[PDB]
């Protein structure tokens, strides 16, 4: 039921206007019958994940672009896709009337929407907060006696997450990251700027900080929320730079290694939270593989690290083979996970461009590239923001897939949302990326995966302005003849048996 | 001859204050006997290329790091060091009273200063202009009859360049680069944003554009100025991004190749300017090696390309090994030159930081890294800016080694100026990079060169906060005992015979 209500704001494409009584949604999912395929299409001209189906052909009579599926070339398994429940996202969602709130959550979490199964949760404040605070703001409180959650957790974030879980049919995984420690644990005594933990790994500052993870997890467990994973620190490299404008805590790779080895790993291992995974890095991929070499060749640290979390500034450009590829080569049993991505912030261009096709294309290009270099999940940044791209106490505004307009009790679904949906909606946890080869150089971006039930899903992004005719071959079934219109993204699904 | 007059503005180091009647300057160089070395020292604590001399002993007193000269390992030969005579630089210089103008010119170009020997010169307007213009703004003038130089050239740039050549130690080379063509040759009809030359290589538009290069060289030659080299286009990748705010002209690597092959090479070869070198790319190193593969494997393109020009801004998305290192491996006889050696310039920071040591250390680290990855030359960007980092008709962002304060008839020499000088002053054209072997893992950056007269120069940059004890060995001479203070840069000079 219910198509997108489009509105142009002068940019390349439209947004979809949602309010208290109306929001675009999908019908509950059917699967195509064996011998047919399903196609979801989004265009810069305005199609929004439209469902169509076609026949799978037995024969293909040469000789244009062919993408061959390689079912037996088996790669990484997928953890999931989601975004971040920041103070700012929660604050915006809740500023809406209760019914508009539900249509917004259903868009991300339910099967009537794009079926996210990951939520990233800051541990205390970040730049997407309207005040700086930690859970332990009493100075020198080493025992953590005045550890508590503020209203941001108890009245905003946690009630929202619960509502997300009730809406979702997929199991949802929670991921936690700290931006800063209490200031009394830090060399510079401030939430921002250059500074790291006082003293050295093994000592009372480091033990206290490690205990602060356990106290956080207990506080959330009391509200009936259990975490899948935590990261060692959000963007540890940030806290090494003088003048770093917002919450941060500096770790060189050697500091992070020793911190995990001496403190964070054992503290977590000897707690009721021993099943929580620990991810290292949580920072720009350009720090790989070096960061991974320092930490993971230390067996005392490696025994506790489940994975490597990476960030990207979406405005800026790769190679990825030299980072993600090499990291995987070196540590094939250590999963890579994209924990944050956002589109800026060009300068030049506004923080929020309502309707930007380019920004959407930047998301799917990124997800595809990540998928092709072994990455197992992709977590977007703020779930929702206002039209200024905030609130953000440091004015570090960015874009988000859903923009809330509180004065009108409406929200807008950006192209980013749909570009994300082409992946989150159809690649459940346990899907496995398989091989896909091109018959000739082309302008498309594609990735192929196997759904845990054996069915296929292939995403095809066309960043050129020209329609590109293509066929996909899957030896088990035959041929999918199709066209990828210029400036479009399609997801193709079909049974193999 | 005259020491630095220090002033703080509340950052890590000081600047040197210069005015109509005082500038810090050097005495002519000296040729100390065999066994004696010269040290020039700058420190964050305030010392500014301070001269001292010491012994090279037969005995080794030190027990820490050893750097050993290996004069027989020979590497690239140096073209030289310089900066950009943009509109903004010219306006800033010329707003000083004439005695202050010469002190500032002498600072860069003279033996009393740091001996630049390259100047980069934009072909018409760029963002560091106070208005948009090209040399051929009257439409559909394919024969470029109305081609002429505005007062920006004839009144500002050219007289300053003449003055610099009069003042200079060394022969100075000029390097030219265009930002945009006349807009009536462009797909988009605009000085900026996403747009190329109309049509395809070989046609009338590409032919007129190529003739524009020759008209420029002719025009400058009437003023009695010959160029060493031109680039194909300043930052061609920029004109591929929609909304790009500064003057630009987009070329894909393929387009650059065919343009050079069909038009820009043959046109310059058939002219009295056939000796002018052509550099390709002139962009961020992250487009390497790809761009070099695209252009230099076409032998119709390759025969015209003398070398590859690179910019530093986005180096942090790199790194050098994968871009510069690899490009040298694939094309060992094509020189790498840094055509815009600046800065970046973190998002929370003010445009100009008077007395920022950190930006200084970024320059020298970056020259060192360039040197260890085969780079033969450097052009810094604006020779001078105002304290707002302008004038720029679009936006301020970058610092400059000299900041002019016209209301006070004074200019400030930033730590950048001295970091640049530690190289440009002591490393003349024809110098050759040579082996320098570190005996053990250490925190310093170092490079060694051989002066064309056979003497050694070694630059040692210490970016850590700790003093590092150090010995330098010349197999032909002995051991030089020294200390590299934290946050310091030294250059050592000694005769080898
Ligand atoms: C909700 O949006 C639909 C447009 O889809 C419209 O018919 C209705 O008026 C809107 N409600 C409000 C309160 O604006
Ligand atoms: C120029 O600088 C010198 C040295 O600091 C100083 O003696 C002189 O007063 C300055 N001139 C003016 C006009 O301030
Ligand atoms: O991957 C992009 C880098 N992040 C930018 C984001 O805007 C910030 O709010 C966030 O707090 C940081 O983790 C850094």
Q: Bridge-partner residues for A346, per DSSP?
A: none
Chain B partners within 8 Å of A318 (Cβ)? 317
Do the Cβ atoms of A119 and A164 come closer than 8 Å? yes
| Nearest CA distance, B286 vs chain A (angstrom) | 8
Distance, in Å, from the CA atom of B179 to the CA atom of B198, rounded to the nearest integer, reads: 16
End-to-end CA distance of chain A, in Å? 29
Out of B387, B406, B431, pick the residue that ends a domain: B431
Is the same domain home to A51 and A85?
no
How many domains are there within chain B?
Answer: 2
Residues A333 and A240 in one domain: yes
Domain end call among B403, B431, B459: B431
- The residue assigned the tokens 């490079």 is B447
Q: Is the CB of B245 less than 8 angstroms away from the CB of A347?
A: yes
Flag if B395 and A245 touch (Cβ within 8 Å): no
Same domain, A85 and A221: yes
Co-location of B454 and B405 in the same domain:
no
List Cβ neighbours of B155 (8 Å cut-off, separation of 6 or more): none
Residues 297-326 of B with CB under 8 A from A: 314, 316-319, 322
B357 with B463, same domain: the answer is no
Q: What angle do CA A486, A492, A494 make, to 5 degrees?
A: 160
Whether residue B317 and residue A317 make contact (CB cut-off 8 A), yes or no, is yes
B226 with B325, same domain: the answer is yes
Residues B420, B496, single domain; the answer is no
Residue B419, both tokens: 């970091």
Q: Are A368 and A459 in contact (CB under 8 A)?
A: yes
Query: Is there a single domain that holds both residue B152 and residue B239?
Result: yes
Task: Decide if A323 contacts A288 (C-beta within 8 A).
Answer: yes
> Looking at the CA of B4, which ligand is closest?
2
Q: Are A377 and A338 in contact (CB under 8 A)?
A: yes
Alpha-carbon span B16 to B6, nearest angstrom: 5
Report the alpha-carbon distance of residue A48 to residue A18 in Å, rounded: 14
Question: How far is the first Cα of chain B from the last one, in angstroms, to the nearest whole number?
Answer: 28
What percent helix, strand, coil does chain A show, rounded to 5?
25, 30, 45
* A87 lies in the same domain as A65: no
Tell me, yes or no, whether A89 and A39 share the same domain. no
- Which of B296, B495, B380 lies closest to B117 in space, CA to CA? B380
Are B62 and B161 members of one domain? no
Q: Which residues of B are catalytic?
A: 235, 340
Asked if A477 and A397 sit in the same domain, the reply is no
Count chain A–chain B contacts defined by CB atoms under 8 A: 27
* Domain CATH code at residue B248: 3.20.20.80
Tokens representing residue A71 in the block: 């079912």
**Ligand having the closest approach to the CA of B7:** 2
Q: Best interface-test mutation with A: which of B243, B283, B397 has the largest number of A CBs within 10 A?
A: B243
Looking up residue A494, the CATH number of its domain turns out to be 2.60.40.1180
Using a CB-CB distance cutoff of 8 angstroms, which residues of chain B are in contact with residue A358? 242
**At what resolution in Å was this solved?**
2.5
- The set of residues, in sequence order, having a beta carbon less than 8 Å from that of B182 and lying 6+ positions away, is B134, B135, B136, B137, B139, B141, B212
The whole domain housing A134 covers 5-30+78-431
Which residues form the pocket of ligand 1, taking CB atoms under 6 Å from any ligand atom? A 5, 19, 21-22
Distance B390 CA to ligand 2 centre (A): 25
CA B478-B482-B486 angle, to 5 degrees, is: 150
- Atom 2 of ligand 2, residue of closest alpha carbon: B22
Task: State the angle between helix axes of A87-94 and A158-167 in degrees (0 to 180), rounded to the nearest 10.
Answer: 70
Tell which of A431, A452, A470 closes a domain: A431
The token duo for B271 is 């002219």
| d(C-alpha A447, C-alpha A453), whole Å | 18
| Whether A419 contacts A112, CB under 8 Å | no
A230 to chain B, closest Cα gap in Å: 27
């Amino acid at each position: 039921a219910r198509p997108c209500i489009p509105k142009s704001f002068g940019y390349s494409s439209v947004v979809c206007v949602c309010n208290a009584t109306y929001c675009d949604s999908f019908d509950p999912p059917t699967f195509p019958a064996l011998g047919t395929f399903s196609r979801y299409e989004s265009t810069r001209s305005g199609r929004r994940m439209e469902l169509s189906m076609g026949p799978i052909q037995a024969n293909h009579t040469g000789t244009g672009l062919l993408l061959t599926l390689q079912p037996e070339q088996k790669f990484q398994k997928v953890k999931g896709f989601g975004g971040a429940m920041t103070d700012a996202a929660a604050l915006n969602i809740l500023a809406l009337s209760p019914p508009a709130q539900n249509l917004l959550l259903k868009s991300y979490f339910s099967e009537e929407g794009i079926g996210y199964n990951i939520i990233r949760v800051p541990m205390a404040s970040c730049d997407f907060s309207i005040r700086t605070y930690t859970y332990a703001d009493t100075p020198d409180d080493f025992q953590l006696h005045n550890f508590s959650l503020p209203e941001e957790d108890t009245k905003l974030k946690i009630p929202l997450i619960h509502r997300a879980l009730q809406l979702a049919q997929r199991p949802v995984s929670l991921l936690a990251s700290p931006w800063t420690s209490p200031t009394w644990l830090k060399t510079n005594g401030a939430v921002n700027g250059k500074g790291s933990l006082k003293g050295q790994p093994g000592d009372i500052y480091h033990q206290t900080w490690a205990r602060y993870f356990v106290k956080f997890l207990d506080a959330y467990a009391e509200h009936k929320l259990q975490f899948w994973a935590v990261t060692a620190e959000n963007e540890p490299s940030a806290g090494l730079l003088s003048g770093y404008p917002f919450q941060c805590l500096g770790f060189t790779p050697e500091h992070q290694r020793d911190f995990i080895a001496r403190d964070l790993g054992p503290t977590l291992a000897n707690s009721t939270h021993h099943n929580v995974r620990l991810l290292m890095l949580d920072d720009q991929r350009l720090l790989l593989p070096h960061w991974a070499k320092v930490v993971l060749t230390d067996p005392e640290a490696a025994k506790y690290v489940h994975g490597i979390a990476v960030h990207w500034y979406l405005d800026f450009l790769a190679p990825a083979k030299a980072t993600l590829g090499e990291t995987h080569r070196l540590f094939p049993n250590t999963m890579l996970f994209a924990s944050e991505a956002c589109v800026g912030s060009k300068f030049w261009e506004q923080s929020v461009r309502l309707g930007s096709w380019d920004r959407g294309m930047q998301y799917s290009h990124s997800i595809i590239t990540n998928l092709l270099y072994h990455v197992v999940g992709w977590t977007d940044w703020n779930l929702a923001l206002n039209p200024e791209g905030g609130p953000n106490w440091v004015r570090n505004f960015v874009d988000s897939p859903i923009i809330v307009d509180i004065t009108k009790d409406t929200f807008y679904k950006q192209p980013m949302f749909y570009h994300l949906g082409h992946f989150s909606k159809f690649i459940p946890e346990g899907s496995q990326r398989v091989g896909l080869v091109a018959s000739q150089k082309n302008d498309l971006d594609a990735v192929a995966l196997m759904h845990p039930d054996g069915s296929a899903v292939v995403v095809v992004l066309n960043r050129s302005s020209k329609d590109v005719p293509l066929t996909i071959k899957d030896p088990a079934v035959g041929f999918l003849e199709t066209i990828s219109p210029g400036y479009s993204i399609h997801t193709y699904l079909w049974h193999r048996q």
